[PDB]
Amino acid sequence: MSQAFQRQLTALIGYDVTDVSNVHDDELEFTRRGLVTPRMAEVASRDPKLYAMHPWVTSKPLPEYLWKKIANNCIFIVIHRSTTSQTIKVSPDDTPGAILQSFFTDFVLRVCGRDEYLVGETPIKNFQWVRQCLKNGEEIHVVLDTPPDPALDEVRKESLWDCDRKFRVKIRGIDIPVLPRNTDLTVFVEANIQHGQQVLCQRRTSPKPFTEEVLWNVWLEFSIKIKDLPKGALLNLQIYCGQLLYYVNLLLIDHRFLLRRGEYVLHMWQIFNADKLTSATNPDKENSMSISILLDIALPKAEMPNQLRKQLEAIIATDPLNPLTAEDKELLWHFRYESLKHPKAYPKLFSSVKWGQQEIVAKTYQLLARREVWDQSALDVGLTMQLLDCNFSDENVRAIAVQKLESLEDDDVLHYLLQLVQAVKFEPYHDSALARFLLKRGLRNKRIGHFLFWFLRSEIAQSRHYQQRFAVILEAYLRGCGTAMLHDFTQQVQVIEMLQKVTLDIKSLDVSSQVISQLKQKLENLQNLNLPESFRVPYDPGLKAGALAIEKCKVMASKKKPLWLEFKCADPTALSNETIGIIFKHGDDLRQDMLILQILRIMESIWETESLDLCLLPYGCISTGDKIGMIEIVKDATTIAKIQQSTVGNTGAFKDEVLNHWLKEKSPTEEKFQAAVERFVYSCAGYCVATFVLGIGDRHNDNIMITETGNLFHIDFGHILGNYRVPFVLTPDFLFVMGTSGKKTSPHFQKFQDVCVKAYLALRHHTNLLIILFSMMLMTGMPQLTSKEDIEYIRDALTVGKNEEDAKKYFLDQIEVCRDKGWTVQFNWFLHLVLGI
Ligand SMILES: c1cc(-c2ccnc3ccc(-c4cnc5[nH]ncc5c4)cc23)ccn1
């Protein structure tokens, strides 16, 4: 042993994976070593040319709505070379390699103005880019040039079951330097032996006056035998006053299958939040509450009656958040071999396991050894995800879920990457099948790797609870992604580190000339001999930002003073001259927004399977650090509030016809207008459903935007989530566009209802998928929204356990609730947010 290298990694990671200042064992270093094999295996087995060109493809059928967009078996592609330019007809079913020969009669077709290649043996209609142009009504322009040298992607060269005694732990005492100014209070230590949120046993100390030092010197003996402890069980240590104030966790079985042994001084965390599960200890040793404990062995590795079958089937059919009674679990377990025949029973069945009994666990492994129907079943992501949530601590169970994820194609790993990374928070151990899966899939595909880096880095920078685990995973990735990516990552971070500083300096300073002048001045200096001459857009990797357009850069008139930034595209082969627009904002935990936007993408894909295209606009958004990150500026967009602020202003005097007026104005040909009107109808219904199902529908119209072409979309998800009546936003102005007012109707309004109904019942067809992603989303991403009531909102919103007919009438009623309310809620939002009442 690389020093200037481990230094670079550290800077890329934002955390030093060699720092053992905050550990009580070697699990992290052990994980560092373990991840060497998965990394090397994958780097050794990846195609250099495929890896360098990263074809973005899918094997899904071309949506019905995209088929119609095609005339005959014909698709035109415009090819560019030096100065020449010739369009070429194509069949949606032929490879790019064939199209190439149809052009002449070693170059590769790269998209103009993007790092995106149409390569490989896939039909041209199956490249995500081609599907994007078709949908948008944009034309496919490619440049013909030489393939990227794979040389650039070079990687730098390098017995428990015999101890029948009851488990015990001695609580020595707790220590905190300065305690709250709240005299006096009383405290006790609660110690829980946990396994997948199942409390196997629980003991508390006696009450003791809450002083800066509290000594008990008491042994807590549990009802559980040491030989019954399950791998992955936690000693959960909590301090209560008299309310929960502090918590810390310690793994009972360690990463080498060894019973935890000895003296511990654990710095605790201060108060279904996933943070509560971490086995990491507080880094702040000088302020944090401390607990002292002492411990004291290696862990080895007839026909159903009809009424019962019905009962079992009714159990298996309930939603993932439906509670199991003791009776349900006993039925499940008793009939485990029959349950094993239904992949959908698996989560509930493995919830029926008494993990605190060695003999039960042994039988459960006997179950898992009889896994043929599971391995033969078609991938069901919703079902798999349920095995990776907070209810399962057994790694054999969680491993069969990851095994199913193995068959995902790149495009689908992208769809689910954010929440897969978040699900690492539910892993008992730092080294897990899931972590290695993410690592492997990131090293296999540059597009996946890019988002993995940023998803990980985002958590490493604002989560003390998990930064250590995540940082170890990011390092393994950075050691195999290759030089070219390393550099691009380095550039991006340098750029963002500079833009971040500028944002803060500006905030410290209506936007007066002084703050405007400072912004432009600061941006001038950076651009002058300070900022890299090109960097990839973290939310749109194929895109490369060039130089700032300081003329268009401005400080937005918001209370957190977001930077509105403009860039030219560095790629000269870029047709248009449109700038690349990035909002740069401090003050919000944009991770929440990220999660809402990711769900939006999942809802669209769901709709796609039903050949439906509600027209959501899930803009790019990346959390880069502590309460900071970037947001994609959508072109040609104004806020619904501003649209109406024109005709009026100060007074909350909303007018009904204004929105429609604005759409007519913004359409050159009267034909474009009717399309915009239709686009409005679909994106409106899409947002009413999506927003209703997520519970974020009641918005002030300043947080709802619209495109010149009629694409409605919600923004500012952080604000509502952070401060969390009408079921969604469908106001007189929206209704007017569809051609209705009061006790009336319209073709477009009939259309609206219909679409909502379709969209909605379609989401219900994936109820389980939606419920598990929603549940996880709250637990790992919105701490302030992790109460029992919070997690369960979506059960009601999806009207779980209802006919499509009952469900349909339910949503229609919701549409009618909006009608009856008119501008009433908007008026209220205005009073509050615009002035303050
Ligand atoms: C000015 C501009 C915009 C805007 C225009 C175009 N595209 C956009 C994309 C995203 C956002 C947006 C979304 N969520 C946000 N949270 N905080 C700022 C923030 C900004 C905003 C935009 C929205 C409101 N006022």
From Swiss-Prot:
Identify the SUPFAM superfamilies for this entry: ARM repeat (SSF48371), C2 domain (Calcium/lipid-binding domain, CaLB) (SSF49562), Protein kinase-like (PK-like) (SSF56112), Ubiquitin-like (SSF54236)
Query: Where is it mainly found?
Result: cytoplasm
Task: Identify which top EC class this enzyme belongs to.
Answer: transferase
Instruction: Name its pathway.
Output: Phospholipid metabolism; phosphatidylinositol phosphate biosynthesis
UniProt family annotation: Belongs to the PI3/PI4-kinase family.
Q: State the disease linkage annotated in the record.
A: Immunodeficiency 97 with autoinflammation: An autosomal recessive disorder with variable features. Affected individuals have childhood-onset antibody defects, cytopenias, and T lymphocytic pneumonitis and colitis. Some patients may have features of hemophagocytic lymphohistiocytosis.
In Swiss-Prot or TrEMBL terms, this protein is called Phosphatidylinositol 4,5-bisphosphate 3-kinase catalytic subunit gamma isoform
Q: In which organism is this protein found?
A: Homo sapiens (Human)
Q: What is the lineage of its organism?
A: Eukaryota, Metazoa, Chordata, Craniata, Vertebrata
